[PDB]
């Protein structure tokens, strides 16, 4: 098998969770299944003191809010800037091949 | 008396922050003199920034004076 | 890369020549110029403009007045009233004019305009005394 | 540090660090749990084997979330939560020593 | 074209030029004028 | 206004020790496979090639190919300050051994290479230039003490920023309550301002330490 | 998203059945510990007051010794009270 | 300054500055440079 | 108390760095006046640099006020 | 006499605010030299502004002088 | 107790060493406003040098802050 | 005997205030150099205001030293 | 017990001077900002002198910090 | 023993006041460099005025150090 | 024993006053940078004055060390 480069990465919901996890429960507990298990697990860890809500939790919230604001504000510009550099490399390589043939 | 001595020493050590406001006032009002010798026609907005400079330098001087009373009467 | 346009009503010295350093005595301070300098302009005063080209050659050009302008494109336009090399100048003549200027200052009295002219010639004479004796 | 000796460029083609280049074994996903003991005992537990198994898994994850052209921030958020989750369980002894509820 | 001291201060690109005060601008303008007039007088005399 | 807590720097809190907290930047390294790079590889390549161009003015012949060490030192400092601010990770830079590894071996590398190559110039660096005879000896002794303990303060500097940064964040977190919306929002917004300061200083501290080592490897 | 597909008619019954069981066990345990919390807090408060009163007397003794040590160090006059 | 304080134009200052410069050109260049009007 | 006195003395000596905020604010806001004395039409862009200078200088002010609270209620 | 002793130390540590008056007066009147070296035509407008700056800078020195007496014969 | 009491006093005396870091910060960021006012076309390179100035300015105050943290609950 | 002890510490801490006179004098005579380098034709007028700067800074410094003597013989 | 205890008081007050080192470093680098708006062509030579200025400024802070370590545990 | 002890603390506090002379000297010889970098022909009267600033700043510095000995062996 | 503890506070207090030498050294080397930005052909004279500026500011710093050494083992 020749490894072919895909164009888009794997589908992802809620920012980071794989969609392959969410679609894994569709045939048994439907779409609402993974969200129900995630909500129940979050409730269980908070209630049974497994997740210690200490001072670092507020820092974890502050990072999450800052990260969401920073990515949503500058993500399009950076991704376009990176895709611009990729296109210039692709143009440079295809022009080399055409110039060598000519 | 021992905790009264702590309040008086703590107040006398917290009232040195007004020295920095004394320097910060001198810097802004000092730079105002130079900034008004060059291009004196901008007097009104120059004076506004000078008052803005005073309204933050002296105000942070009162930040320590508030802590001076916080070590004197309140706590 | 520093274009030099040092001219004068009498002579012409440089025309878009690359110079490493030119030090100019101006009314805003006797500062110096390097390529890609600060975009600014200033008024010349009696003093010794110096030229240090790409070969490091030192040349001294005393001027009596003028203008100095440095633009954002690294273009230097120094125009001076009468720029001469200082080697064709006399320190004895410099002190003779300086002594003459001192006489004008002392004999000015209530003539404040003549007092200013004596002061002006004093500055020129003192500039040439340092120029010729250095 | 070299390419694995099981790799053959003539049959497979160019090397791909996310593909297992040994004998084609049946993966654990389709094991009907009656062969679970046989499958676990068959796969060796060398430090070399598990290190190669980690890198073959890591490059599989790179092939799904970074190596595609339009790779977003999702892998780099997954790693941060993944490391935070893993390091919270490590520091569980210090965290649970404080807690919030006396009874819970 | 010959401008004035007041017009020079009000110029849009004159802010890029530094060390600007009243006496520097006034003396530079009144000597740039006497350098432009000298340039035209030499051009006019040769052309005439 | 309630209380405070500390001691987030225990390396052996569990039997899987906190030495794995130093092996986390190996994950974030951009492993490259394709010919045309991906988006994060090009971003990392553009940043590093940008830093190499900026440091090219200060390289010199004695650091002809040591820029790879300087850049690797930069990325190690950045990934030991950025990762030290995420919540449930022990402060690796707080441990002095990380800072010992950061400053001491490279300083000994630079001072011994200077002493072997240019011994008189190294001693002349311990004197201010153009120093007369009555002004000489006290400047020499103090600058001898300066150059001996300057990298030790560099190690202290790298430690103290993240120690003070994490102490401030833990202080702000511990003085808040989940139930009170006013206190939680104030605590969260205060930490966001503090994190923006702490993220900014962490990058700048890594940038200056690259600049300082590039200057001190040039000589 | 994907179209909805109904859950199997055994997951729902197990889910809600465990939901009801958790509610009554939650009510039973909370009431049992509420009585336990009330009786434990009362006896904890009584022994805390007695312990704090004894610790206050010990702290008063230690502070006077500390004040006595300070006057010995400073060499200042020792008052009748302190 | 003194020139502006005494209300003297810079052009008048220029002529005084250049006349004093020209009077210090004793050996050969005084007559050649000064062509009058 | 002896340790209560140590907290108060530390707190009073923790208010020292408020003077540094006043000097840093006075330097930035004064130098803004000189920087605005030239280019009066460049008000808004240069104002952003000064507020950045004010925010960092005042961040040092709250940095010293951090140890004021630590020596008042924490240590 | 310990409470009076602490007040003597507290007032003595409160008279360091005169250092704020020293730097501010020195900086303002130094800047006046630069501001009067060039443009001496406005030497009455600049002098009036500097005396305003001197008065506010010296007011902070009198603030700490008051605070020294406020820990002396006020409590 | 008295050993711990003097540890808190020394911690407060170590908090003194942050005011000058606030002074150096205000000097760099104030001069940055002048630096951007004169030839604003060099905005990015001048900002890099001023940020480099801020890197070493607060770090000198962090030495005393770490010394304050050493005498707070580390010594 | 602690009243004489408190006076010794207080007068020592009061004498810090002459530092602000020291920095101010070094500032005004520093700016006098810049003022003399730019338009030296007003030398005596600039030097006159420089002495007025010196007579308003060192006077505050010796005002603080006077308070040090008062803290040894009046307070 | 008060020997190492007051050593900790002295050590906190000994590391004060790093503040002025921070003020000194900001003075050098702030003046590099003004000194680079004019004359970018001397970037390397100005920076090397500024580094020597920075090195002598940070040497003073380390001079005080070594004195702080001298009283901490070096006896 | 108390009197010798408190004189030792007071003389230590009185030795801070030479810091401002340290900043003032570093200020006046700073601006001497600027004042000589512009119109260097006046080096004679510039250095005469610069040594006047040094002879006044360091004199106030020795004024503090003279008072330090007065609280170390005189009183 | 009390004299041992009082020597430690005073020796630490004596090293407070080296911050001014730290700031002034940055001032004189900062103004070297501006003064050598313009007028680059006076490098020898400008840098020789920076050495003289450093030689006098650190001399005040060593005067702090002299009194710190005097209050650590001499007296
Ligand atoms: C002085 C010299 C200076 C030199 C400077 C040189 C120049 C700069 C060079 C820069 C170089 C950077 C280095 C390389 C970086 C490479 C990045 C890259 O390639 O990414 C491409 C990337 C392209 O991404 P894309 O997906 O194609 O487009 C993005 C979309 O536009 C975005 O829009 P969207 O709507 O599609 O995105 C949504 C996404 C956007 O969100 C985010 O990206 C932020 C996510 C959070 C941030 C991290 C927090 C993680 C947790 C930390 C704390 C742990 C404690 C636990 C949790 C507590 C809090 C709940 O997520 C959401 O908001 C929705 C879900 C929310 C998830 C957050 C967590 C919620 C958890 C809820 C419960 C679930 C289970 C939890 C279990 C544990 C409890 O573009 C970027 O570069 C983006 C990053 C830019 C940087 C941001 C910061 C700076 C500004
Ligand atoms: C994700 C990792 C890559 C997944 C790629 C994958 O599944 O295919 C590649 C491959 C399987 O390919 P395949 O068998 O040919 O095709 C199967 C299909 O992909 C289809 O896969 P499948 O049919 O085996 O099912 C997917 C499977 C995937 O298999 C796994 O379980 C993963 C196997 C690798 C083990 C280590 C996983 C990474 C560390 C986990 C802890 C950190 C997670 C952080 C993010 C999640 C936060 C909640 O996941 C599950 O078994 C489901 C677990 C669901 C548990 C949680 C329920 C949802 C909670 C929602 C909460 C919402 C709150 C609001 O998986 C691997 O070998 C992955 C190796 C990864 C190495 C570690 C690299 C570092 C990872 C980050 C740290």
Numbering used by the authors:
A (entry chain K): 1 to 102
B (entry chain 3), I (entry chain 2), J (entry chain 4), K (entry chain 1), L (entry chain 5), M (entry chain 8), ...: 1 to 75
C (entry chain H): 15 to 148
D (entry chain R): 3 to 106
E (entry chain G): 173 to 220
F (entry chain N): 1 to 219
G (entry chain T): 3 to 84
H (entry chain I): 11 to 47
Sentences from the paper on this structure:
Unlike in mammals, mitochondria of the crustacean Artemia franciscana have the ability to accumulate large amounts of Ca2+ without undergoing the mPT. Here, we performed structural and functional analysis of A. franciscana ATP synthase to study the molecular mechanism of mPTP inhibition in this organism. We found that the channel formed by the A. franciscana ATP synthase dwells predominantly in its inactive state and is insensitive to Ca2+, in contrast to porcine heart ATP synthase.
State 2 was the most prevalent in this dataset, which we selected for further analysis. The final local refined maps for  F1 and FO at state 2 had nominal resolutions of 2.6 Å and 3.9 Å, respectively. The F1 and FO local refined maps were combined to generate the composite map of A. franciscana ATP synthase. In the maps of A. franciscana ATP synthase (state 2), each non-catalytic nucleotide-binding site in α-subunits is occupied by an ATP molecule with an accompanying Mg2+ ion. The nucleotide-binding site in the βDP subunit is occupied with ADP, and the site on βE is empty in all the maps.
